[PDB]
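[worker-b] picked up task from shared queue
[worker-b] task type: protein-ligand structure
[worker-b] ligand name resolved to 2'-deoxyguanosine-5'-diphosphate; SMILES cross-checked against name lookup, match
[worker-b] sequence length check passed
[worker-b] input payload:
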Amino acid sequence: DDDFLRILNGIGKSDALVVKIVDIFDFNGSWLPGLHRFVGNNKVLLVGNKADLIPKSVKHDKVKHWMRYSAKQLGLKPEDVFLISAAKGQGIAELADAIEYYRGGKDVYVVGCTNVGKSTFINRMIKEFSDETENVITTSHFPDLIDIPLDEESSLYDTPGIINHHQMAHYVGKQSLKLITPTKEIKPMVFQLNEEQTLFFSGLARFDYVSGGRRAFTCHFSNRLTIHRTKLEKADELYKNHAGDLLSPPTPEELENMPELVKYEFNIREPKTDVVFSGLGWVTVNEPGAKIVAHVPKGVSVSLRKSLI
Ligand SMILES: Nc1nc2c(ncn2[C@H]2C[C@H](O)[C@@H](COP(=O)(O)OP(=O)(O)O)O2)c(=O)[nH]1
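[worker-b] inference finished, payload out:
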């Protein structure tokens, strides 16, 4: 896309600070691939939004470490990493302080995938900087987006939200998306499963515990998401007949316009390990030796990380 390339090069040519917002519950789904090569000369702040949804047991220091590590794997080395709740306000004041410090008197560009919370964050920034300057907000066209004065000589620029065609939220509608997203702090639900058992996180993803005897699994998902538990040999049959009805989301219409569910295998060899379904939630495995087969639509990310508790 010619449009997005032009702005990336423009931002790269400037000495501006880049603020990249990601959804902490959809880290890989909301990642902007390639951004790192265009803003290599620029200082970047990586901002993880929706911190209010993080369970109390999860440590923010470990979340930031995981964000920093994950960004590094994908070629981005941010100056620093921040956790915020644009909705509730947590971390906003500190981030505003950091933006002022790191920008070094230059402009700032805010970038993000759709639904990460960029509009909500931009609203927080307008408030944070409102009492600071005599210049007023202006709108400007992409070759109306907001330009927020930081002082009389520099501004913070909102940029058009990017559509990631492969993230989970791209395959669901408004009514459907409401069920998958947590409205409040995620409450960790403790499961005790035997070998050859299956968990369906609605009709969008599957978790197969294929080998390792009897174990405990802590699931972290939206309270509006329905988790269906079956025997492994019954899982295939249930999905072929009840997806779109019982195993919904997705709806029958969304099922037809969605990539086919693809499998991935994992073998955990260390204690406290999360199976992370981007855009959905995560399953914690306290003990090593578990053999797991995760199912996710073609394109959507599922990965492993060390627990953040
Ligand atoms: N729980 C939680 N939800 C949030 C937060 N910030 C934004 N949201 C919600 C509000 C919207 O329903 C949805 C998308 O927000 P938005 O600001 O319109 O995102 P964007 O498409 O402009 O990137 O996410 C936040 O900090 N916490």
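[worker-b] attaching auto-annotations
[worker-b] The chain is about 25% helix and 30% strand.
[worker-b] releasing lock
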